[PDB]
Amino acid sequence: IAMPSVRKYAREKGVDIRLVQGTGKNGRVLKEDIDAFLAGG
Amino acid sequence: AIETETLVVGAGPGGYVAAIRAAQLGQKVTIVEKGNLGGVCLNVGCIPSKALISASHRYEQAKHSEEMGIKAENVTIDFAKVQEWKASVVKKLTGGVEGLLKGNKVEIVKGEAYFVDANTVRVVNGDSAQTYTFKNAIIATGSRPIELPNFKFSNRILDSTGALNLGEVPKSLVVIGGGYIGIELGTAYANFGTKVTILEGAGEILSGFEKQMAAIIKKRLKKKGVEVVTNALAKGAEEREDGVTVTYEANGETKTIDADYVLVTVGRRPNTDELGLEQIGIKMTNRGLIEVDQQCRTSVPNIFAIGDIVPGPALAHKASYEGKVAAEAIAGHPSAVDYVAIPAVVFSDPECASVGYFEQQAKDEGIDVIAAKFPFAANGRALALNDTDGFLKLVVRKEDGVIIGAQIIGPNASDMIAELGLAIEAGMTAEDIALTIHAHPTLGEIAMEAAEVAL
Amino acid sequence: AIETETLVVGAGPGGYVAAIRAAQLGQKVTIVEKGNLGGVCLNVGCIPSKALISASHRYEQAKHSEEMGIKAENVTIDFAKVQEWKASVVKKLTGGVEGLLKGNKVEIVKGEAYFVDANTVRVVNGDSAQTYTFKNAIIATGSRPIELPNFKFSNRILDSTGALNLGEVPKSLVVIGGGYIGIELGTAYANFGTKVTILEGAGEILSGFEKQMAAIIKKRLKKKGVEVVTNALAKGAEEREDGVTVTYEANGETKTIDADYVLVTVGRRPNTDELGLEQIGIKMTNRGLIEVDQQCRTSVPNIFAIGDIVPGPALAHKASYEGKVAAEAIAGHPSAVDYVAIPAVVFSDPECASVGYFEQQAKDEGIDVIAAKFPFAANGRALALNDTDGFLKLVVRKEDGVIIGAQIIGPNASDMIAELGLAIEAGMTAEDIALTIHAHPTLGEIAMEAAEVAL
Numbered sequence A: 001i002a003m004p005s006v007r008k009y010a011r012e013k014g015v016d017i018r019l020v021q022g023t024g025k026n027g028r029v030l031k032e033d034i035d036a037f038l039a040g041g
Numbered sequence B, C: 001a002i003e004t005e006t007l008v009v010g011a012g013p014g015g016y017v018a019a020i021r022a023a024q025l026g027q028k029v030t031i032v033e034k035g036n037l038g039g040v041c042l043n044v045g046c047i048p049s050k051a052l053i054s055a056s057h058r059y060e061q062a063k064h065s066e067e068m069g070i071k072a073e074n075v076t077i078d079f080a081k082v083q084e085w086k087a088s089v090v091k092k093l094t095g096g097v098e099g100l101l102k103g104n105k106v107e108i109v110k111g112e113a114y115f116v117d118a119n120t121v122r123v124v125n126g127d128s129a130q131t132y133t134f135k136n137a138i139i140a141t142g143s144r145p146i147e148l149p150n151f152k153f154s155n156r157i158l159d160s161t162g163a164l165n166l167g168e169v170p171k172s173l174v175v176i177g178g179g180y181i182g183i184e185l186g187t188a189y190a191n192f193g194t195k196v197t198i199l200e201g202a203g204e205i206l207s208g209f210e211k212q213m214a215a216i217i218k219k220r221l222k223k224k225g226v227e228v229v230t231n232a233l234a235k236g237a238e239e240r241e242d243g244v245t246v247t248y249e250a251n252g253e254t255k256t257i258d259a260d261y262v263l264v265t266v267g268r269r270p271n272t273d274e275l276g277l278e279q280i281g282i283k284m285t286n287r288g289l290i291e292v293d294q295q296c297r298t299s300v301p302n303i304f305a306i307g308d309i310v311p312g313p314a315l316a317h318k319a320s321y322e323g324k325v326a327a328e329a330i331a332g333h334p335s336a337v338d339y340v341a342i343p344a345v346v347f348s349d350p351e352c353a354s355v356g357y358f359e360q361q362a363k364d365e366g367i368d369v370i371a372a373k374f375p376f377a378a379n380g381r382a383l384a385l386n387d388t389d390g391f392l393k394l395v396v397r398k399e400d401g402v403i404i405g406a407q408i409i410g411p412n413a414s415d416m417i418a419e420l421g422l423a424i425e426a427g428m429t430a431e432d433i434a435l436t437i438h439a440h441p442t443l444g445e446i447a448m449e450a451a452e453v454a455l
């Protein structure tokens, strides 16, 4: 569950959305959820 | 007297869904209506007009598909049938509302309400009056057109309801007021062959919409033979028993127009007068509207107000929406009228619709925005329909590409707007739309190609 | 000999957009095309098809608005003008394509391209043959009609293209193949007055859509005097040199039918044959479809494939999307094919649109899904349009309220589909839509009432 844009973000950022921070709210992965899995570490 | 839990005054879009909701919320509701259930929307508003407008376009088209090689010779219109058909439509919908109310055991009461105190209403009907003391009350009385003095409504000086119920297509018609109701009813009769003359006092018609949108509408309306006079000052009318002579001063020149009827659509005033609201202490706003909180509660807690008498766009959905919210707050159920935006639609030839901020109000609100516009002309579907006039504008917040407003003028804009409306509520960015594959070849494809431009 | 960087074979929707995003990304692009730019969609596919249907409906409506009091007389159809008009729409759009390419300075080469090796292609332009050396190439050759065994194409045994160019309205037409193309061209001519008989081998026309949707479309075809013969097996056609005799078996019975023309629309095959791909090492499938990865790459790394020659829905938009993905991937952009669904629209009388899963497909996929179905018969605008046959269906994942599929059958379904589509693509729920205020009275709002039903 994610907006096309968010999916694009992970893509260009070389992240595996399949296993990325499901930040919740709706139960979806947000741009920052990607940032967390990335910049977080 | 008669005791009740939640008293609802008015069975229009706001009153009836509020009565329905409240009943479903376990409350015992009594709905008071003086006329037809359904209110303005079903009886003399939304439905009748769209019905009429729809028939007029079937006429515009039959008679003008020349370019496509279809030549219809002698296209007739039996307005009697047109009205019969319109009649049956309205009857189906009102029949429905009538059903919905009973199917949720709401006691409908025919009579005119009046607040005797902050907890009791006198309902009059015939030579009988009955007192009802309620636990809660929701005022949903709607609005009505403005009778301009020296334009007092008569057999030939009409209001929106009168133009809707005309027995036969007038040869001529003068329209005072270029708002949606005016432009709509004006265009409709123009399609049927009536020589229309719309006089708006302001510099431009359709105040609310961007001037560009108004431009396209005027251009095509002139092709239909309609004449549009802005900055016009209607002075009055000498009603003959066979037409009406309207006098008005436009740009320092007094002129005269003989017509069959005159339609005064200069606005609508709230039905908040002689209701006792003054007495029970309901603080009204400068324009007669009733001030309410985020839960539509008036200055008297146990009293709510919704729809047309409350601030905001006088649209059916605002009404039904605030209707729901109200009953919720009544039933404790936490709620607030915090929606993101209500789309507005106008059924002019090139259909109009908008939702969210216009480039203007966004900028003046100090918001950083970009405006992306795409022409229907560069679209295969539009070309196929042979209607290239129109465009889609998208205003996105520059500081994140989030969509905040969208405006469409062209075919099916009232349907196309739905998509853009969802995005705006979802806080979707222009890219979210551009990445989505829309159908082909369709008018919706345009939204995708517009967001494209916004990147 | 002539050196280049990115060679694009084919100027179709997938071809030219690919040739454009690439140029956008600084790539030196050379596009090859044996015929006209725009490919199938513009010249003999989407555009002409919808244009002919539009004209046909203007005609249907002109002669049949008797219910709204509109009665014409002697409505003439001039097919020669119809064709002229359609021809201009096409020529208009074609120019756009040529313009876009040249504007982005894409090298345009006229000729039949042939792959000599993994980095070279020779294009034969008649007795001419030039050789273009490239770095990477994109093959977007599209597809073509399947010629049935005993139905050899001629001026009387047509393919979609043959029907789109008919010089006159046929007295009678036999359509072999009840798919969207067969149903669209069949209905259009049924609108112009032609006696149309559809022969589908399967048990139901519009195979890829719900049986309910087809039932409605068939019911209207019947109203028009269209005879739909399902479970029929077409055996052959003898061109009587003045018409055609078609013999088909059905329920044991072997019958023959005479018609002025026969239209074969059983399927389209990939244009991957006689291209040299087999020598170049490009892995394909038995049917002829090229094996491709998430970035539309073939087995030969510098060779990409998009459009009808690769797997997926045979749609202009699926082609265009991949076109972009290809060029981006070529450039370095970590692009990939990522969409959750693509909408498909059929321009039948009650037009229909679908996106996502059909209720059945969902459960057969092993998914607990609920399905909400809302009728246009209830919607106010539908009543005004006086087309109340139709509905909207929402296929919702019971486990999270996430919408995964939607089907609409009724007026403007092609435009209303966009909203539901954007919802699927972004993973929204029935509540997300139900909590969005739609326009009233419009058709797009049915989505709001259906989601309400889903909740």
Ligand SMILES: Cc1cc2nc3c(=O)[nH]c(=O)nc-3n(C[C@H](O)[C@H](O)[C@H](O)COP(=O)(O)OP(=O)(O)OC[C@H]3O[C@@H](n4cnc5c(N)ncnc54)[C@H](O)[C@@H]3O)c2cc1C
Pocket (backbone or CB within 6 Å): B009, B010, B011, B012, B013, B014, B015, B032, B033, B034, B035, B036, B037, B038, B039, B040, B041, B044, B045, B046, B047, B049, B111, B112, B113, B114, B140, B141, B142, B143, B160, B161, B181, B271, B306, B307, B308, B309, B314, B315, B316, B317, B319, C440, C441
């Ligand atoms: C011709 C025209 C076209 C319009 N087109 C559209 C459009 O297409 N889209 C849109 O959104 N809006 C449209 N509107 C406006 C829209 O109809 C209103 O916004 C909507 O009806 C408001 O709903 P409501 O419940 O507030 O009021 P109403 O529908 O006005 O309901 C008010 C009810 O209160 C009853 N009432 C009043 N006083 C009393 C009393 N004392 N006792 C008992 N009953 C009482 C009235 O009889 C009435 O039935 C149009 C209006 C007009 C006139």
Ligand SMILES: Cc1cc2nc3c(=O)[nH]c(=O)nc-3n(C[C@H](O)[C@H](O)[C@H](O)COP(=O)(O)OP(=O)(O)OC[C@H]3O[C@@H](n4cnc5c(N)ncnc54)[C@H](O)[C@@H]3O)c2cc1C
Pocket (backbone or CB within 6 Å): B440, B441, C009, C010, C011, C012, C013, C014, C015, C032, C033, C034, C035, C036, C038, C039, C040, C041, C044, C045, C046, C049, C111, C112, C113, C114, C140, C141, C142, C143, C160, C161, C181, C271, C275, C306, C307, C308, C309, C314, C315, C316, C317, C319
């Ligand atoms: C009647 C009909 C109706 C349709 N309706 C729809 C619709 O409503 N919506 C929709 O999305 N799709 C529709 N389609 C499908 C649509 O036409 C295709 O999906 C789309 O055109 C595919 O584009 P493409 O770029 O893959 O190939 P094409 O558009 O087929 O173009 C491929 C190009 O390659 C050229 N070519 C082939 N081989 C070579 C070669 N070796 N050298 C040089 N040139 C070559 C061909 O001339 C052609 O121009 C319809 C198709 C038909 C026939």
